[PDB]
Amino acid sequence: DSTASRYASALADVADVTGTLEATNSDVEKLIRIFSEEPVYYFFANPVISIDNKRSVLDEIITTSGLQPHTANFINILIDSERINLVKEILNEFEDVFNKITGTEVAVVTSVVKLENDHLAQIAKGVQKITGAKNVRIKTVIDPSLVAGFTIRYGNEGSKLVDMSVKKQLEEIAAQLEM
Amino acid sequence: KKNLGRIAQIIGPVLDVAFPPGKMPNIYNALIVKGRDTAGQPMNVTCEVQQLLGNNRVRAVAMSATDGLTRGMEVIDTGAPLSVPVGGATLGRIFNVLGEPVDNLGPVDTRTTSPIHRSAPAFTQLDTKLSIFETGIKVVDLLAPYRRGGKIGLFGGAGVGKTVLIMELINNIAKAHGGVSVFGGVGERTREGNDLYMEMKESGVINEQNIAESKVALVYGQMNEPPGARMRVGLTALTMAEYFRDVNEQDVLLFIDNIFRFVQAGSEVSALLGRMPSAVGYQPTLSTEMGSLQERITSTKEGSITSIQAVYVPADDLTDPAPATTFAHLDATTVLSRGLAAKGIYPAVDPLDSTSTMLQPRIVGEEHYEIAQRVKETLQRYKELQDIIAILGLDELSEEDRLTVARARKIERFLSQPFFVAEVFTGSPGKYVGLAETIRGFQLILSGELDSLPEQAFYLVGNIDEATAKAMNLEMESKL
Amino acid sequence: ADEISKIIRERIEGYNREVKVVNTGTVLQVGDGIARIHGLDEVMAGELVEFEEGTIGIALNLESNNVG
Numbered sequence A: 001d002s003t004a005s006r007y008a009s010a011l012a013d014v015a016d017v018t019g020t021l022e023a024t025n026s027d028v029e030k031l032i033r034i035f036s037e038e039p040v041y042y043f044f045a046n047p048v049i050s051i052d053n054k055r056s057v058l059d060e061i062i063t064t065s066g067l068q069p070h071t072a073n074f075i076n077i078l079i080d081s082e083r084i085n086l087v088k089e090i091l092n093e094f095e096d097v098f099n100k101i102t103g104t105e106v107a108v109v110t111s112v113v114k115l116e117n118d119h120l121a122q123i124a125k126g127v128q129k130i131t132g133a134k135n136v137r138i139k140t141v142i143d144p145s146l147v148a149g150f151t152i153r154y155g156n157e158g159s160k161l162v163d164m165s166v167k168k169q170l171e172e173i174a175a176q177l178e179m
Numbered sequence B: 001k002k003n004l005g006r007i008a009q010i011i012g013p014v015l016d017v018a019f020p021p022g023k024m025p026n027i028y029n030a031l032i033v034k035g036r037d038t039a040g041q042p043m044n045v046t047c048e049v050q051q052l053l054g055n056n057r058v059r060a061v062a063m064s065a066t067d068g069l070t071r072g073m074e075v076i077d078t079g080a081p082l083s084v085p086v087g088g089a090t091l092g093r094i095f096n097v098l099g100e101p102v103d104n105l106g107p108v109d110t111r112t113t114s115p116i117h118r119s120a121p122a123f124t125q126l127d128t129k130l131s132i133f134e135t136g137i138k139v140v141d142l143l144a145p146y147r148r149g150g151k152i153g154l155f156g157g158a159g160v161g162k163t164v165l166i167m168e169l170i171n172n173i174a175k176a177h178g179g180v181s182v183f184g185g186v187g188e189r190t191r192e193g194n195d196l197y198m199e200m201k202e203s204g205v206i207n208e209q210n211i212a213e214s215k216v217a218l219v220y221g222q223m224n225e226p227p228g229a230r231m232r233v234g235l236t237a238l239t240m241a242e243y244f245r246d247v248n249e250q251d252v253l254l255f256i257d258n259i260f261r262f263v264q265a266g267s268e269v270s271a272l273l274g275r276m277p278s279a280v281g282y283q284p285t286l287s288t289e290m291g292s293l294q295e296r297i298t299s300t301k302e303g304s305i306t307s308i309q310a311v312y313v314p315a316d317d318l319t320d321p322a323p324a325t326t327f328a329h330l331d332a333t334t335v336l337s338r339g340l341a342a343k344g345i346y347p348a349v350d351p352l353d354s355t356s357t358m359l360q361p362r363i364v365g366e367e368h369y370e371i372a373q374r375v376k377e378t379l380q381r382y383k384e385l386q387d388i389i390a391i392l393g394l395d396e397l398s399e400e401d402r403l404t405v406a407r408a409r410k411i412e413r414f415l416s417q418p419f420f421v422a423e424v425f426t427g428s429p430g431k432y433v434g435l436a437e438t439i440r441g442f443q444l445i446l447s448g449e450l451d452s453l454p455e456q457a458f459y460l461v462g463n464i465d466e467a468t469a470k471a472m473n474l475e476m477e478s479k480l
Numbered sequence C: 001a002d003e004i005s006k007i008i009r010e011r012i013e014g015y016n017r018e019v020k021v022v023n024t025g026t027v028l029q030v031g032d033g034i035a036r037i038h039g040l041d042e043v044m045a046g047e048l049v050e051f052e053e054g055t056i057g058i059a060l061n062l063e064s065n066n067v068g
């Protein structure tokens, strides 16, 4: 495991023991869109800034968006330890550990064109029947490089891949050269 | 290209720059840095990417001076692996590693550029005509013959030879080989390079009048350069030779000296680059980098690149990896020994260890092979009787073995040559001797037929008849 | 996101302008020998910094966060 993965596993474990896992996931999405937009990251980093000013501004940002307290507790502990500079990576791996704990799996269906929602749910049926996740989430990405079909990037993170696409030509022609 | 850089960190010569995520240069892809100098704005220091760190930033060793660079400078990548101008333009000019002229004359044309770091030539087309060369040195033309169209190693300690020997060899062969010459000053002292440049412009090889008439094209990445430049000066010389072997189809003789610097600079940048240290302190990719240089030098069915690298065996560490992997690549190794320059026998080439893949009889001549065998066996006998001589008195060994010791002494003095370029250190005029004359000399010397001359009549002597005359002169001035 | 947080955004950009002045840097670590200042995005390698105590220092190591 990575340090970001450990901290994210802590946050997901607390959001597991307290029945606020979905609210905490939404709160992490809010917090990662906060810790994007560099100047905020630059402020919470830069150890020249005094710790009291940092925690005060963090309290203000907490009471602004109405976060869950244990997630606010998580960011405040991140400020306590010197590991606040990993905050983007921790909030990024939170999605992984949260999907693993709540039991759902992500399948990024990348096709040439946007896909119908019922047929996307059919893709979710299939991916679920090979993975075995409860609420399989499908975030689709329109792509111009593909030609007719689609690619699925289900798995841990990109790990498994099935694609009926320009890869059809690519494999037929890797077997056409035959050297 | 157009990929603006924003240099993140500058840790010594190795600087790592954070490109945008999509547009990222490849490995060994040049990066001209749009930066300011210590005074005055325009200053482009060239960097070649070594690896990609994955945080959108690549690590790039800097070919030029590293000071003055700030964190955050815009840099752009050429997209081409550091193109170097070669061909009919590169003649006569001392060239920088960047691909620039250094001798303050007019800039060259870039109509015949070429990538410096390219694929090695395939084994499918490999010209190997085993043939001997007459360089001029008594010992190295007899004991360790040199393979033209092949690689030659002038190994030695610190100051044993290997640069005066290279100067003598170039003074001999620069006129003999109708093909062009290429000198790669890989980490050699700047004053010896300038001595070489003066010697070349005086000996007609440069011919500064019409600079398109030179039989040579120099490349100097000499000592006073950041370890990027010493990491690629060898490859610049290699690109010039590879053009002269791809296009002009002529047998180009390239000289590299202190090729060990092409491994030392790699070490100095590799330690910084995050790559872990290998054995005694060089880079981990010693073998691959050394091979990536020394494999491009092969006669490749359009011409024959004979090359003479002067490896620097550091502190006479014959087991050091930087010469130990070069002994694998080098055909006609000539291990110069400090212990033989101790007693003044110049050149201090070891008669034993200087060995060649061209001392096979079908390749060299049966008479040549038998005389080289007898000379090397006599010197091995002398080395094995050194300890008996050292302690138990010279006389207490065998009487026939005493004949062998006197013969070995006469041999290991006679294989000393008065060079033309070393006339300043000896005071005696330089003498050139072919292979045939020294062969006939060694015959009568070791045959015991003229075992009556004095020893100093064989030392620092061009030929056997010169030795006989020197014995007359010496015996006359002895009594008189 | 931070639409209502415009005031705290002005506050944090104010704190950044407090700590991040150009040609300026703050000494995180000062070991026996070297120091490790934070900042100096303007500095060149080998440039002489002045420590505002009267102790000159040369900057040989430019890492990402801290200039050594």
Ligand SMILES: Nc1ncnc2c1ncn2[C@@H]1O[C@H](COP(=O)(O)OP(=O)(O)O)[C@@H](O)[C@H]1O
Residues within 6 Å of the ligand: B156, B157, B158, B159, B160, B161, B162, B163, B164, B192, B346, B347, B417, B418, B419, B422, B425, B426
């Ligand atoms: N033929 C020779 N006669 C006299 N001295 C020599 C001869 N060959 C080498 N030397 C001495 O040994 C040195 C070898 O040359 P040098 O460039 O120092 O070798 P390296 O490049 O290995 O340091 C010369 O400086 C010279 O003093």
